[PDB]
Coordinates of C-alpha atoms and ligand atoms in Angstrom, one line a residue:
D799 CA 28.4 22.1 32.8
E800 CA 26.1 22.3 35.8
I801 CA 23.3 22.8 33.2
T802 CA 24.2 21.4 29.7
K803 CA 25.7 18.2 31.0
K804 CA 23.4 17.9 34.0
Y805 CA 21.7 14.7 32.7
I806 CA 24.6 13.3 30.7
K807 CA 24.1 10.1 32.7
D808 CA 20.7 9.7 31.0
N809 CA 22.5 10.7 27.7
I810 CA 20.6 14.1 27.6
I811 CA 21.9 17.5 26.7
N812 CA 20.2 20.5 28.3
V813 CA 20.3 23.0 25.5
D814 CA 18.2 25.9 27.0
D815 CA 17.6 25.3 30.8
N816 CA 14.2 23.9 30.1
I817 CA 14.3 20.3 31.5
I818 CA 13.9 19.0 35.0
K819 CA 14.2 15.4 36.2
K820 CA 11.5 14.4 38.7
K821 CA 10.6 11.4 40.7
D822 CA 7.0 10.7 41.7
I823 CA 4.8 7.6 42.5
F824 CA 2.5 6.4 39.8
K825 CA -0.6 4.2 40.2
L826 CA -0.7 1.0 38.2
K827 CA -3.9 -0.8 37.4
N828 CA -4.4 -4.3 36.1
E829 CA -7.4 -6.2 34.7
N830 CA -8.7 -7.0 38.2
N831 CA -9.0 -3.3 39.0
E832 CA -6.1 -3.7 41.5
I833 CA -3.9 -0.7 42.1
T834 CA -0.2 -1.1 42.9
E835 CA 2.1 1.9 43.1
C836 CA 5.7 2.5 41.8
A837 CA 8.2 5.3 41.9
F838 CA 9.5 6.4 38.4
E839 CA 12.1 9.0 37.4
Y840 CA 10.8 11.1 34.5
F841 CA 11.7 14.3 32.7
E842 CA 9.5 17.3 32.2
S843 CA 9.6 20.8 30.6
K844 CA 10.0 23.8 32.9
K845 CA 8.0 26.0 30.5
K846 CA 4.7 24.2 30.2
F847 CA 3.2 23.6 26.7
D848 CA 0.2 25.6 25.6
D849 CA -1.8 22.4 25.0
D850 CA -2.9 19.1 26.6
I851 CA -0.6 16.7 24.8
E852 CA 1.4 14.5 27.1
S853 CA 4.9 16.0 27.1
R854 CA 6.7 14.2 29.9
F855 CA 8.6 11.0 29.2
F856 CA 10.7 8.2 30.7
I857 CA 14.0 7.4 29.0
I858 CA 15.3 3.8 29.1
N859 CA 19.0 3.1 29.1
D860 CA 21.3 0.6 30.7
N861 CA 22.1 2.8 33.7
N862 CA 18.6 3.6 34.9
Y863 CA 16.6 0.6 33.6
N864 CA 13.7 0.1 36.0
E865 CA 11.9 -3.2 35.3
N866 CA 8.7 -1.8 36.9
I867 CA 8.2 0.5 33.9
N868 CA 6.9 -2.6 32.0
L869 CA 4.0 -2.7 34.4
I870 CA 2.5 0.3 32.6
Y871 CA 1.8 -2.0 29.6
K872 CA -0.4 -4.3 31.8
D873 CA -3.9 -4.7 30.4
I874 CA -3.8 -1.9 27.9
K875 CA -5.8 -1.9 24.7
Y876 CA -4.1 0.7 22.5
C877 CA -0.9 2.7 22.5
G878 CA 0.8 5.4 20.4
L879 CA 3.9 4.1 18.6
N880 CA 6.5 6.1 16.9
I881 CA 10.2 5.8 16.1
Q882 CA 13.1 8.2 15.3
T883 CA 15.5 7.0 12.6
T884 CA 18.9 8.3 11.4
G885 CA 17.6 8.4 7.8
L886 CA 15.0 7.2 5.4
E887 CA 16.5 4.0 4.0
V888 CA 15.8 1.0 6.3
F889 CA 18.9 -0.8 5.0
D890 CA 21.4 2.0 5.5
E891 CA 20.0 3.6 8.6
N892 CA 19.3 2.8 12.3
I893 CA 16.5 3.1 14.8
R894 CA 17.5 5.9 17.1
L895 CA 14.5 5.9 19.4
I896 CA 11.3 3.9 20.0
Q897 CA 8.4 5.7 21.7
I898 CA 5.3 4.1 23.3
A899 CA 2.6 6.5 24.7
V900 CA 0.2 4.8 27.1
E901 CA -2.9 6.8 28.0
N902 CA -2.4 9.0 31.1
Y903 CA 1.3 8.2 31.4
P904 CA 4.5 10.0 30.3
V905 CA 5.8 8.6 27.1
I906 CA 8.2 5.6 27.4
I907 CA 11.2 6.4 25.2
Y908 CA 13.7 3.6 24.5
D909 CA 17.1 5.1 24.0
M910 CA 18.3 2.5 21.4
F911 CA 21.9 3.9 21.1
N912 CA 22.3 3.4 24.9
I913 CA 20.7 -0.1 25.4
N914 CA 22.6 -3.4 25.2
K915 CA 20.7 -5.7 27.5
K916 CA 18.0 -7.8 25.7
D917 CA 15.9 -7.8 28.9
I918 CA 15.2 -4.1 28.5
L919 CA 13.2 -4.7 25.3
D920 CA 11.2 -7.7 26.5
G921 CA 8.1 -5.8 27.6
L922 CA 8.5 -3.8 24.4
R923 CA 8.5 -6.8 22.1
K924 CA 5.4 -8.2 23.8
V925 CA 3.3 -5.0 23.3
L926 CA 4.3 -4.9 19.6
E927 CA 3.5 -8.6 19.0
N928 CA 0.3 -8.5 21.0
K929 CA -2.5 -8.8 18.4
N930 CA -4.9 -7.5 21.0
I931 CA -3.2 -4.1 21.5
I932 CA -3.7 -1.5 18.8
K933 CA -0.5 0.3 17.9
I934 CA -1.4 3.8 16.7
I935 CA 1.2 4.9 14.1
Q936 CA 1.7 7.7 11.7
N937 CA 3.2 6.3 8.5
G938 CA 2.9 2.7 9.5
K939 CA 4.6 1.3 6.5
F940 CA 7.7 3.4 7.2
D941 CA 7.9 2.5 10.9
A942 CA 6.9 -1.1 10.6
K943 CA 9.6 -1.6 7.9
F944 CA 12.3 -0.4 10.3
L945 CA 11.0 -2.5 13.1
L946 CA 10.7 -5.6 11.0
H947 CA 14.2 -5.2 9.5
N948 CA 15.5 -4.9 13.1
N949 CA 13.9 -8.2 14.2
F950 CA 10.9 -6.6 15.9
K951 CA 7.5 -8.4 15.4
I952 CA 4.4 -6.2 15.2
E953 CA 0.7 -6.8 14.6
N954 CA -2.5 -4.8 14.9
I955 CA -2.0 -1.3 13.5
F956 CA -4.1 1.9 13.1
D957 CA -2.3 4.2 10.7
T958 CA -3.4 7.8 11.2
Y959 CA -1.9 8.6 7.8
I960 CA -4.2 6.0 6.1
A961 CA -7.2 7.3 8.0
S962 CA -6.5 10.9 7.0
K963 CA -5.9 9.9 3.4
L964 CA -9.2 8.0 3.2
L965 CA -11.1 10.8 4.8
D966 CA -9.6 13.3 2.2
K967 CA -11.2 11.2 -0.6
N968 CA -8.4 12.3 -3.1
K969 CA -9.3 16.0 -2.9
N970 CA -5.7 17.0 -2.0
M971 CA -2.3 15.6 -2.9
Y972 CA -0.5 17.3 0.1
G973 CA -1.2 17.8 3.8
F974 CA -0.7 14.3 5.2
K975 CA 2.5 14.7 7.2
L976 CA 2.2 14.4 11.0
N977 CA 2.6 18.2 11.4
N978 CA -0.3 18.9 9.1
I979 CA -2.6 16.2 10.6
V980 CA -2.0 17.3 14.1
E981 CA -2.5 21.0 13.3
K982 CA -5.8 20.1 11.6
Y983 CA -7.4 17.7 14.1
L984 CA -5.8 19.0 17.3
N985 CA -4.8 22.6 16.5
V986 CA -1.3 22.0 17.9
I987 CA 1.9 22.9 15.9
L988 CA 4.6 20.4 16.7
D989 CA 8.3 21.4 16.5
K990 CA 8.9 20.0 13.0
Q991 CA 12.3 21.7 13.1
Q992 CA 13.6 18.7 15.0
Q993 CA 13.2 16.4 12.0
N994 CA 16.4 18.0 10.7
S995 CA 18.3 17.7 14.0
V996 CA 21.2 15.2 14.5
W997 CA 19.9 11.8 15.5
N998 CA 23.1 9.8 14.9
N999 CA 24.8 10.9 18.1
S1000 CA 24.6 8.9 21.3
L1001 CA 23.3 12.1 23.0
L1002 CA 20.1 14.0 22.4
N1003 CA 19.0 17.4 23.6
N1004 CA 15.8 18.2 25.5
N1005 CA 14.1 19.7 22.5
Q1006 CA 14.6 16.6 20.5
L1007 CA 13.1 14.4 23.3
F1008 CA 10.1 16.6 24.0
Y1009 CA 9.4 16.3 20.3
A1010 CA 9.9 12.6 20.3
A1011 CA 7.5 12.3 23.2
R1012 CA 4.8 14.7 21.9
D1013 CA 4.9 13.3 18.4
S1014 CA 4.0 9.9 19.9
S1015 CA 1.4 10.8 22.5
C1016 CA -0.5 13.0 20.0
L1017 CA -1.3 9.7 18.3
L1018 CA -3.6 8.8 21.3
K1019 CA -5.7 11.9 20.6
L1020 CA -5.7 11.5 16.8
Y1021 CA -6.9 7.9 17.1
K1022 CA -10.0 8.8 19.0
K1023 CA -10.9 11.6 16.6
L1024 CA -10.0 9.7 13.4
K1025 CA -11.6 6.5 14.6
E1026 CA -14.9 8.4 15.0
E1027 CA -14.7 10.2 11.7
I1028 CA -14.0 6.9 9.9
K1029 CA -17.1 5.4 11.4
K1030 CA -19.3 8.3 10.5
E1031 CA -18.1 8.1 6.9
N1032 CA -18.7 4.3 6.9
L1033 CA -15.0 3.8 6.0
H1034 CA -14.3 1.2 8.6
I1035 CA -14.2 -1.7 6.2
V1036 CA -11.7 0.0 3.8
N1037 CA -9.7 1.6 6.6
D1038 CA -9.4 -1.9 8.2
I1039 CA -8.2 -3.5 5.0
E1040 CA -5.7 -0.8 4.4
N1041 CA -4.3 -1.0 8.0
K1042 CA -3.9 -4.7 7.7
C1043 CA -2.3 -4.4 4.2
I1044 CA 0.7 -2.5 5.7
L1045 CA 2.4 -5.8 6.6
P1046 CA 2.0 -7.5 3.2
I1047 CA 3.4 -4.3 1.6
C1048 CA 6.4 -4.3 4.0
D1049 CA 6.8 -7.9 3.1
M1050 CA 7.1 -7.1 -0.6
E1051 CA 9.5 -4.2 -0.1
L1052 CA 11.8 -6.1 2.3
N1053 CA 11.9 -9.2 0.2
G1054 CA 12.6 -7.3 -3.0
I1055 CA 13.0 -9.4 -6.2
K1056 CA 16.2 -11.0 -7.5
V1057 CA 17.7 -10.0 -10.8
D1058 CA 19.6 -12.3 -13.2
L1059 CA 22.5 -10.1 -14.2
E1060 CA 23.6 -12.5 -16.9
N1061 CA 20.5 -12.0 -19.0
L1062 CA 20.5 -8.3 -18.1
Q1063 CA 24.0 -7.4 -19.3
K1064 CA 23.5 -9.9 -22.2
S1065 CA 20.3 -8.2 -23.4
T1066 CA 22.0 -4.9 -22.9
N1067 CA 24.8 -5.9 -25.3
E1068 CA 22.2 -7.3 -27.8
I1069 CA 19.9 -4.3 -28.0
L1070 CA 23.0 -2.1 -28.0
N1071 CA 24.4 -4.1 -31.0
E1072 CA 21.0 -3.6 -32.8
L1073 CA 21.2 0.1 -32.1
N1074 CA 24.7 0.4 -33.5
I1075 CA 23.5 -1.7 -36.4
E1076 CA 20.9 0.9 -37.0
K1077 CA 23.3 3.8 -37.0
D1078 CA 26.0 2.1 -39.1
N1079 CA 23.7 0.4 -41.6
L1080 CA 21.4 3.4 -42.0
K1081 CA 23.5 6.6 -41.8
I1082 CA 10.8 0.4 -40.5
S1083 CA 14.3 1.8 -39.6
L1084 CA 12.9 4.7 -37.6
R1085 CA 10.4 2.7 -35.5
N1086 CA 13.1 0.0 -35.0
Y1087 CA 15.8 2.4 -33.9
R1088 CA 13.4 4.4 -31.7
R1089 CA 12.0 1.2 -30.1
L1090 CA 15.5 -0.1 -29.3
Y1091 CA 16.6 3.3 -28.1
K1092 CA 13.8 3.7 -25.6
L1093 CA 14.3 0.0 -24.6
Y1094 CA 18.0 0.5 -24.0
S1095 CA 18.2 4.0 -22.5
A1096 CA 14.8 4.2 -20.7
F1097 CA 15.1 0.7 -19.2
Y1098 CA 18.3 -1.4 -19.7
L1099 CA 20.3 1.6 -18.6
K1100 CA 18.1 2.8 -15.7
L1101 CA 17.3 -0.5 -14.1
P1102 CA 20.9 -1.3 -12.9
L1103 CA 20.7 1.8 -10.8
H1104 CA 18.3 0.0 -8.4
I1105 CA 20.1 -3.3 -8.2
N1106 CA 21.5 -4.1 -4.7
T1107 CA 25.1 -4.7 -5.6
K1108 CA 25.5 -7.3 -2.8
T1109 CA 22.2 -9.3 -3.3
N1110 CA 21.3 -8.5 -7.0
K1111 CA 17.8 -7.6 -5.6
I1112 CA 15.6 -4.6 -6.4
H1113 CA 13.6 -3.2 -3.4
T1114 CA 10.9 -1.1 -5.1
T1115 CA 8.6 1.3 -3.3
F1116 CA 4.9 0.5 -3.1
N1117 CA 2.5 3.4 -2.6
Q1118 CA -0.6 2.4 -0.8
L1119 CA -2.9 5.4 -1.2
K1120 CA -1.4 7.7 -4.0
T1121 CA -3.5 6.7 -7.0
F1122 CA -6.9 8.0 -7.8
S1123 CA -8.5 4.6 -7.8
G1124 CA -6.7 3.1 -4.8
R1125 CA -4.7 0.6 -6.8
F1126 CA -1.1 0.2 -5.9
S1127 CA 1.6 2.2 -7.6
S1128 CA 5.3 1.7 -7.5
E1129 CA 8.4 3.7 -8.1
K1130 CA 12.2 3.5 -8.1
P1131 CA 11.6 1.4 -10.1
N1132 CA 8.0 1.6 -11.4
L1133 CA 7.2 -2.0 -11.9
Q1134 CA 4.3 -1.4 -14.2
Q1135 CA 6.6 0.6 -16.6
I1136 CA 9.0 -2.3 -17.0
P1137 CA 8.5 -3.8 -20.5
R1138 CA 6.2 -6.8 -20.7
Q1139 CA 8.1 -8.6 -23.4
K1140 CA 9.2 -12.0 -22.2
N1141 CA 12.7 -11.1 -23.3
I1142 CA 12.9 -8.5 -20.5
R1143 CA 10.7 -9.9 -17.7
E1144 CA 12.7 -13.2 -17.8
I1145 CA 15.4 -11.2 -16.1
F1146 CA 13.5 -11.3 -12.7
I1147 CA 14.0 -14.7 -11.0
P1148 CA 13.4 -16.2 -7.6
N1149 CA 16.1 -17.0 -5.0
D1150 CA 17.8 -20.3 -5.0
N1151 CA 15.6 -23.3 -3.9
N1152 CA 12.5 -21.1 -4.5
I1153 CA 10.1 -20.7 -7.4
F1154 CA 7.5 -18.1 -8.4
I1155 CA 3.8 -18.6 -8.3
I1156 CA 2.0 -16.0 -10.5
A1157 CA -1.8 -15.5 -10.4
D1158 CA -4.1 -13.2 -12.4
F1159 CA -7.8 -12.4 -12.6
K1160 CA -9.2 -12.9 -16.1
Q1161 CA -12.0 -10.3 -16.4
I1162 CA -12.4 -8.9 -12.9
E1163 CA -13.2 -5.3 -14.2
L1164 CA -16.0 -6.5 -16.5
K1165 CA -17.5 -8.8 -13.8
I1166 CA -17.5 -5.9 -11.3
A1167 CA -19.3 -3.8 -13.9
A1168 CA -21.9 -6.6 -14.3
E1169 CA -22.5 -6.7 -10.5
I1170 CA -22.6 -3.0 -10.0
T1171 CA -25.1 -2.4 -12.9
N1172 CA -26.9 -5.7 -11.9
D1173 CA -27.3 -6.7 -15.5
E1174 CA -29.3 -9.9 -15.7
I1175 CA -28.1 -11.2 -19.1
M1176 CA -24.5 -10.6 -18.1
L1177 CA -24.7 -12.1 -14.7
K1178 CA -26.6 -15.2 -16.0
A1179 CA -24.1 -15.6 -18.8
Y1180 CA -21.1 -15.5 -16.4
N1181 CA -22.9 -18.0 -14.1
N1182 CA -23.4 -20.3 -17.1
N1183 CA -19.7 -19.8 -17.9
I1184 CA -20.5 -18.2 -21.2
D1185 CA -17.7 -15.9 -22.5
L1186 CA -18.7 -12.2 -22.4
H1187 CA -17.4 -11.5 -25.9
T1188 CA -19.1 -14.6 -27.3
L1189 CA -22.2 -13.4 -25.5
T1190 CA -22.1 -9.9 -27.1
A1191 CA -21.3 -11.5 -30.5
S1192 CA -24.5 -13.6 -30.3
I1193 CA -26.5 -10.4 -29.5
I1194 CA -24.9 -8.3 -32.3
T1195 CA -24.9 -11.0 -35.0
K1196 CA -28.1 -12.8 -33.8
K1197 CA -26.2 -16.1 -34.3
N1198 CA -26.1 -19.0 -32.0
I1199 CA -22.8 -19.7 -30.2
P1200 CA -21.9 -22.6 -32.5
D1201 CA -22.1 -20.3 -35.6
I1202 CA -20.0 -17.5 -34.0
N1203 CA -16.5 -17.1 -35.6
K1204 CA -13.4 -15.4 -34.4
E1205 CA -14.1 -12.2 -36.3
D1206 CA -17.5 -12.0 -34.5
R1207 CA -15.8 -12.2 -31.1
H1208 CA -13.1 -9.7 -32.0
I1209 CA -15.7 -7.1 -33.0
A1210 CA -17.6 -7.9 -29.8
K1211 CA -14.4 -7.3 -27.7
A1212 CA -14.2 -3.8 -29.0
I1213 CA -18.0 -3.2 -28.4
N1214 CA -17.8 -4.5 -24.8
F1215 CA -14.8 -2.5 -23.6
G1216 CA -15.9 0.6 -25.5
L1217 CA -19.6 0.7 -24.4
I1218 CA -19.1 -0.6 -20.9
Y1219 CA -16.8 2.3 -20.2
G1220 CA -19.1 4.9 -21.6
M1221 CA -18.3 5.5 -25.2
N1222 CA -20.8 6.7 -27.8
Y1223 CA -21.0 5.1 -31.2
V1224 CA -18.7 7.7 -32.7
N1225 CA -16.0 7.0 -30.1
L1226 CA -16.6 3.3 -30.7
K1227 CA -15.8 3.6 -34.4
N1228 CA -12.6 5.4 -33.7
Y1229 CA -11.8 3.1 -30.8
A1230 CA -12.5 0.0 -32.9
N1231 CA -10.5 1.0 -36.0
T1232 CA -7.6 2.5 -33.9
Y1233 CA -7.0 -0.4 -31.5
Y1234 CA -8.6 -3.4 -33.2
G1235 CA -8.0 -2.5 -36.9
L1236 CA -11.6 -3.2 -38.0
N1237 CA -12.7 -0.2 -40.2
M1238 CA -16.3 -0.1 -39.0
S1239 CA -18.8 2.6 -40.1
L1240 CA -20.9 5.0 -38.2
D1241 CA -24.1 3.3 -39.2
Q1242 CA -22.7 0.0 -37.9
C1243 CA -21.4 1.3 -34.6
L1244 CA -24.7 3.0 -34.2
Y1245 CA -26.4 -0.4 -34.6
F1246 CA -23.9 -1.8 -32.1
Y1247 CA -24.7 0.9 -29.6
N1248 CA -28.5 0.5 -29.8
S1249 CA -28.3 -3.3 -29.8
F1250 CA -25.9 -3.4 -26.9
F1251 CA -28.0 -1.2 -24.6
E1252 CA -31.3 -2.7 -25.8
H1253 CA -30.3 -6.1 -24.4
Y1254 CA -28.0 -4.9 -21.5
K1255 CA -30.8 -3.1 -19.8
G1256 CA -29.1 -3.0 -16.5
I1257 CA -26.0 -1.2 -17.9
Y1258 CA -28.2 1.2 -19.8
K1259 CA -30.2 2.1 -16.7
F1260 CA -27.1 2.5 -14.6
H1261 CA -25.3 4.6 -17.2
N1262 CA -28.4 6.9 -17.6
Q1263 CA -28.6 7.3 -13.8
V1264 CA -24.9 8.4 -13.7
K1265 CA -25.5 10.9 -16.6
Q1266 CA -28.6 12.4 -15.0
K1267 CA -27.2 12.8 -11.4
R1268 CA -23.9 14.3 -12.6
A1269 CA -22.6 13.5 -9.1
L1270 CA -19.2 14.1 -7.7
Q1271 CA -19.0 11.5 -4.9
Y1272 CA -18.5 7.9 -5.8
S1273 CA -17.7 4.8 -3.8
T1274 CA -16.4 1.2 -4.3
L1275 CA -17.8 -2.0 -2.9
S1276 CA -15.5 -1.5 0.1
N1277 CA -17.1 2.0 0.4
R1278 CA -13.8 3.6 -0.5
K1279 CA -14.9 7.1 -1.4
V1280 CA -13.7 9.8 -3.8
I1281 CA -14.9 13.3 -4.6
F1282 CA -14.3 14.7 -8.1
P1283 CA -13.3 18.3 -8.8
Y1284 CA -15.8 18.2 -11.7
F1285 CA -18.1 15.7 -13.3
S1286 CA -16.8 13.3 -15.9
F1287 CA -19.1 10.6 -17.2
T1288 CA -16.3 8.2 -18.2
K1289 CA -14.4 8.6 -14.9
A1290 CA -17.5 8.2 -12.9
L1291 CA -18.0 4.8 -14.5
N1292 CA -14.4 3.7 -14.1
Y1293 CA -13.8 4.6 -10.5
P1294 CA -16.1 2.0 -8.8
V1295 CA -14.7 -0.7 -11.1
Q1296 CA -11.1 0.2 -10.7
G1297 CA -11.5 1.0 -7.0
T1298 CA -13.1 -2.4 -6.3
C1299 CA -10.2 -4.1 -8.0
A1300 CA -8.0 -2.2 -5.5
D1301 CA -10.1 -3.4 -2.6
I1302 CA -10.0 -7.0 -3.9
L1303 CA -6.2 -7.2 -4.5
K1304 CA -5.5 -5.4 -1.2
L1305 CA -7.8 -7.8 0.8
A1306 CA -6.2 -10.7 -1.1
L1307 CA -2.8 -9.6 0.0
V1308 CA -4.0 -9.5 3.6
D1309 CA -5.4 -13.0 3.6
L1310 CA -2.4 -14.3 1.6
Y1311 CA 0.0 -12.8 4.1
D1312 CA -1.7 -14.8 6.9
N1313 CA -2.0 -18.0 4.8
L1314 CA 1.6 -18.1 3.7
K1315 CA 3.2 -18.1 7.2
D1316 CA 2.9 -21.9 7.6
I1317 CA 5.2 -22.4 4.6
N1318 CA 7.3 -19.2 5.1
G1319 CA 5.9 -17.9 1.8
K1320 CA 7.1 -14.5 0.5
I1321 CA 4.9 -11.9 -1.2
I1322 CA 6.9 -10.4 -4.0
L1323 CA 4.8 -8.1 -6.2
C1324 CA 1.3 -6.8 -7.1
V1325 CA 0.8 -5.2 -10.5
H1326 CA -2.5 -4.7 -12.4
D1327 CA -4.6 -7.7 -11.5
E1328 CA -1.8 -10.1 -10.7
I1329 CA 0.2 -11.1 -7.5
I1330 CA 3.5 -13.0 -7.4
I1331 CA 4.6 -15.0 -4.4
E1332 CA 7.9 -16.8 -3.8
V1333 CA 8.1 -20.1 -1.9
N1334 CA 10.4 -23.1 -1.5
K1335 CA 10.0 -25.6 -4.3
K1336 CA 8.7 -28.3 -1.9
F1337 CA 5.7 -26.2 -0.9
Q1338 CA 5.0 -25.6 -4.6
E1339 CA 1.6 -27.3 -5.0
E1340 CA 0.5 -26.1 -1.5
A1341 CA 1.3 -22.5 -2.4
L1342 CA -0.5 -22.7 -5.7
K1343 CA -3.7 -23.4 -3.7
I1344 CA -3.1 -20.7 -1.1
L1345 CA -2.7 -18.0 -3.7
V1346 CA -5.8 -19.0 -5.7
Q1347 CA -8.0 -19.2 -2.6
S1348 CA -6.7 -16.0 -1.1
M1349 CA -7.8 -14.2 -4.3
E1350 CA -11.1 -16.1 -4.7
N1351 CA -12.0 -15.5 -1.1
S1352 CA -11.3 -11.8 -1.4
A1353 CA -13.5 -11.5 -4.5
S1354 CA -16.2 -13.4 -2.7
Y1355 CA -16.1 -10.9 0.1
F1356 CA -17.1 -8.1 -2.3
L1357 CA -19.0 -9.8 -5.2
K1358 CA -22.2 -11.7 -4.4
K1359 CA -23.7 -12.2 -7.9
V1360 CA -20.6 -13.2 -10.0
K1361 CA -17.7 -15.5 -9.5
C1362 CA -14.1 -14.6 -10.4
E1363 CA -11.6 -16.7 -12.3
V1364 CA -8.0 -17.0 -11.3
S1365 CA -5.4 -18.0 -13.8
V1366 CA -2.3 -19.3 -12.0
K1367 CA 1.0 -20.6 -13.1
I1368 CA 4.2 -21.8 -11.5
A1369 CA 7.2 -20.1 -13.1
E1370 CA 11.0 -19.7 -12.6
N1371 CA 10.9 -16.2 -14.1
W1372 CA 8.4 -13.3 -14.4
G1373 CA 8.4 -13.7 -18.2
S1374 CA 6.5 -17.0 -18.3
Ligands
LIG956 CL1 -21.7 6.0 3.0
LIG957 CL1 -11.3 1.6 11.7
LIG958 CL1 -12.1 -12.8 -13.0
LIG959 NA1 5.8 7.6 12.7

């Protein structure tokens, strides 16, 4: 009517007589401080908002497209970026809106359901691609994923969700949605009710648009506050790595990993025949039937649920900041819960004309411990390329390296992993006999304990410092920080080691993502201390080097007294 359909030409529904269209003249500045003016039609709320968040907006469609709007983008350095989608899955859903909030201007809202001329998005694509303009985003992985899948290029991101998560230091598992973050840092309550509104129509009501404008311009004010808190916490280095790691993570999720259905259904029939063999031949046997039962039901039966029927690809979900240590986690499916047996990981293959390159660190955790504790014997041994287990064997047995046998090294393995991570000699005994099948005595493990820390004086001093301080706040070599709810000696030792691994892998993915562009390399997976890339077979030897140096250079960034070792192989399946 005169009210509801008043702005139907702009594809807007006036739901409550609370929207006016206005036309004013806006000043436009460039790099040379020159001011040129333009007249723009924008929308505003009749009832003013009880805050200072920019709530006006331009809407861009085919009927009103004013090219001069792109002049707002001239010589800017940051902008709030948000999108509205019709759902959560980038493959099944569409981008309904794109919002860009430039400081001191009403938000520019691209009505994507009512745009069909490519010229309208030109100035948009430039802002996104411009590596010298910061795009402030909330949930950058989610938004970047949609933009990438819709053939939008983007670079330079500051994720307010990553900053808030890092500042929380794993003290809370909830409170990181836009609504929470804005209420905390700005004391403004956004109309979160609009998330459940209908975005699939070619028309939107005024309330949906005021929300799409305010949920994008608020990013400008969150960036200033969060940027300052990051700096005060000395979290810039980690926050920067995490922000740059968004794109490699999107790359992994968008590429997925191809599944060989032949071996899948085959192995399903095989383990199934072994299970039926158990039932028939029975009704050793228990452990066998149970193993095959979990293998079949918990894996062979669940996995097909995630296979893209049209591409035989799995598109897992990588969580950037949901583990205690900062390591990646995955879900739907959880890649680290997939069995390690070569019988099962052989099912994952590269695309045609491509091949996998798989790389691992050998002993990154133990080398990190040596650097953190600054233990002279360990650092010198690593630098002379002496094996750490052989080393400890020579200390325990007092033998020289030529007289050290395999049983000596096996015992030393248990001592190293047990004592480096904070066990006492009693726990060492149980740990050794349980996981290594050694049957050592308390008097022996007591000798191991005293001998270990008598020679590894750096570790002994570091461990004693941790016990005495009983501190709750710990940091990694990237200065990623955590605060414990209560003091645990073994967790205090483990966090800087595991958290530094996270830093190294995440920085390796960032360098790798840049180094692979020349050969259109694809980042596939990151689990534990390994990364998998997929490349055309002709760039095989070139990608082998890129992956190794991306991981070596990352470790070199954090470790100054010890050199990492990368084991790398070229494979046609994940089971190799
Ligand atoms: Cl600090
Ligand atoms: Cl930063
Ligand atoms: Cl290593
Ligand atoms: Na967002």
